[PDB]
């Protein structure tokens, strides 16, 4: 629908870390939405960006991408140290149905919780 | 971890379609894993690939890629019609701890089910 406050739940190993996000509006330079983490001073918070494109002269197929990145600084004011980039991009043809899109979305969402990927993400162990 | 035969249940708009994946080895040419679903011909098989890159001096950063690409066929013999490319790429640093990676992965996984993204992926309506 529109941009409303999103309250994530049970995030992390223990599931005791909860994240609340308030929309920060959509910029008009290139039409990407944005979110932010409530509370803490800006430039020191989680960022979530969602964008939906349209067919172009060069890119006929659709393109929806989600970019998420968050820096964790260390100790007058905290200074950013390093970031953890993470982006997700899809691609659909104009003739594609809703069933296939939903199937891909939920399949990848479930795959991000597999033992294989939980081992391949938290630790750095290549699949072998 | 060994690339065991993963399977997916209660997947879809109504959570009814299920799929089974069998491993198809790992190729040393670029160090990427692979997964696939058993099918009549390789062309129509749903494919899932995961990989992690050694942070060489040219890049000095970690990368994790997950590429999901499944086609569909329509009817002598079926042929591929349209693709459903869907890739996921990560990035980290040498000194990044486990907490940040766990937080990023878990929030991405939980946000994929958030109603905003549910609406965005389905009807492709911009936020």
């Amino acid at each position, epitope marked *: 629908a529109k941009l409303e406050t999103v309250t994530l*739940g*049970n*995030i992390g*190993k*223990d*599931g005791k870390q*909860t994240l609340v996000l308030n929309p920060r509006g959509v910029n008009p330079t290139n039409g990407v939405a944005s979110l932010s983490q409530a509370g803490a001073v800006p430039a020191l918070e989680k960022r979530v960006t969602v964008s939906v494109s349209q067919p172009s002269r060069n890119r006929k197929n659709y393109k929806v991408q989600v970019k998420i990145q968050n820096p964790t600084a260390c100790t007058c004011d905290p200074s950013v140290t390093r970031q953890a980039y993470a982006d997700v991009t899809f691609s659909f043809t104009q003739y594609s149905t809703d069933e296939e899109r939903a199937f891909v979305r939920t399949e990848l969402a*479930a*795959l991000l*919780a*597999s*033992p294989l990927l939980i081992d391949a993400i938290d630790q750095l162990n290549p699949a072998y | *971890a*060994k690339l*065991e*035969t*993963v*399977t*997916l*249940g*209660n997947i879809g708009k*109504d*959570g009814k379609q*299920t799929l*089974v994946l*069998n491993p198809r080895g790992v190729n040393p040419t670029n160090g990427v894993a692979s997964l696939s679903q058993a099918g009549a011909v390789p062309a129509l098989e749903k494919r899932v690939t995961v990989s992690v890159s050694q942070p060489s001096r040219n890049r000095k950063n970690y990368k994790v890629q997950v590429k999901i690409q499944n086609p569909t066929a329509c009817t002598c013999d079926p042929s591929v019609t349209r693709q459903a490319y869907a890739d996921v790429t990560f990035s980290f640093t040498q000194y990044s701890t486990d907490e940040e990676r766990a937080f990023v992965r*878990t929030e991405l996984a*939980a946000l994929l089910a958030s109603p905003l993204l549910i609406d965005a992926i389905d009807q492709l309506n911009p936020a």
Partner: antibody, heavy 118, light 103 residues
Framework: EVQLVESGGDLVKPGGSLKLSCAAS????????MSWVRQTPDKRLEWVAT????????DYPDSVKGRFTISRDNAKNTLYLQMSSLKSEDTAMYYC?????????????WGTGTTVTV | VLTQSPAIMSESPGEKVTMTCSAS?????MYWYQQMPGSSPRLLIY???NLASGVPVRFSGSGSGTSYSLTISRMEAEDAATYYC??????????FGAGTKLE
């Protein structure tokens, strides 16, 4: 789909040393996740000894960790649970379960269950 | 990690009947099973929103922060014995809940 769990588990002294077995009649057992349901005799039930497909990743609750071991083979469609040693507790009839590999939480249709007492 | 439900409710055939469960925490999902008086409990709803796997339409449930509905349809002939509960808090140790009886 007809899960069979017919095994031993007759009453034994508090020393364990017994094995539980399961079998699938027409079910495809090659690529699926299994689990065990410890149902207390009166009302409750708890979760214990769940493994994933491929016999590579296992898990246990933090109550019997390091005391219960699961061995599974793809041949003859069987799985084995090792009952090492009891504490005079857990004298309750057991259930075997089926699950997909990465909705490993929540189980699915399961057959009857056997009993074990100490 | 801790769940509870009201127990021992008697209900004549027809009209409405309901039974809920407590949370005592924040849970992403809240599933439950139906156990026949003999043996072999089955599955139903399993997603707090999806109808069921084998139960024919009548049984339904709705989700919230703590309450989880589990609203039985206007007909409940037989449908006896125990309805359990189960949650998945996105970290391993499963909990389940105490049983309940019907008539």
């Amino acid at each position: 789909e007809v899960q069979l769990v017919e095994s031993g588990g007759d009453l034994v002294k508090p020393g364990g040393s017994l094995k539980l077995s399961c079998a699938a009649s027409g079910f495809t057992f090659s690529s699926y996740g299994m689990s065990w349901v410890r149902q207390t005799p009166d009302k409750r039930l708890e979760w214990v000894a769940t493994i994933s497909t491929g016999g590579s990743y296992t898990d246990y609750p933090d109550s019997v960790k390091g005391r219960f071991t699961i061995s599974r083979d793809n041949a003859k469609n069987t799985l084995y649970l090792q009952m090492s040693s009891l504490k005079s507790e857990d004298t309750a009839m057991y259930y075997c379960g089926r699950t997909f590999t990465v909705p490993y939480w929540y189980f699915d249709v399961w057959g009857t269950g056997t009993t074990v007492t100490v | 990690v801790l769940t509870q439900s009201p127990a021992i409710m008697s209900e004549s055939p027809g009209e409405k009947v309901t039974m809920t469960c407590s949370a005592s925490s924040s849970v992403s999902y809240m599933y439950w099973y139906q156990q026949m008086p003999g043996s072999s409990p089955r599955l139903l709803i399993y997603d707090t929103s999806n109808l069921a796997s084998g139960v024919p339409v009548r049984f339904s449930g709705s989700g919230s922060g703590t309450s989880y509905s589990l609203t039985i349809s206007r007909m409940e002939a037989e449908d006896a014995a125990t309805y359990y509960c189960q949650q998945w808090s996105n970290y391993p140790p499963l909990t389940f809940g105490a049983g309940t009886k019907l008539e």
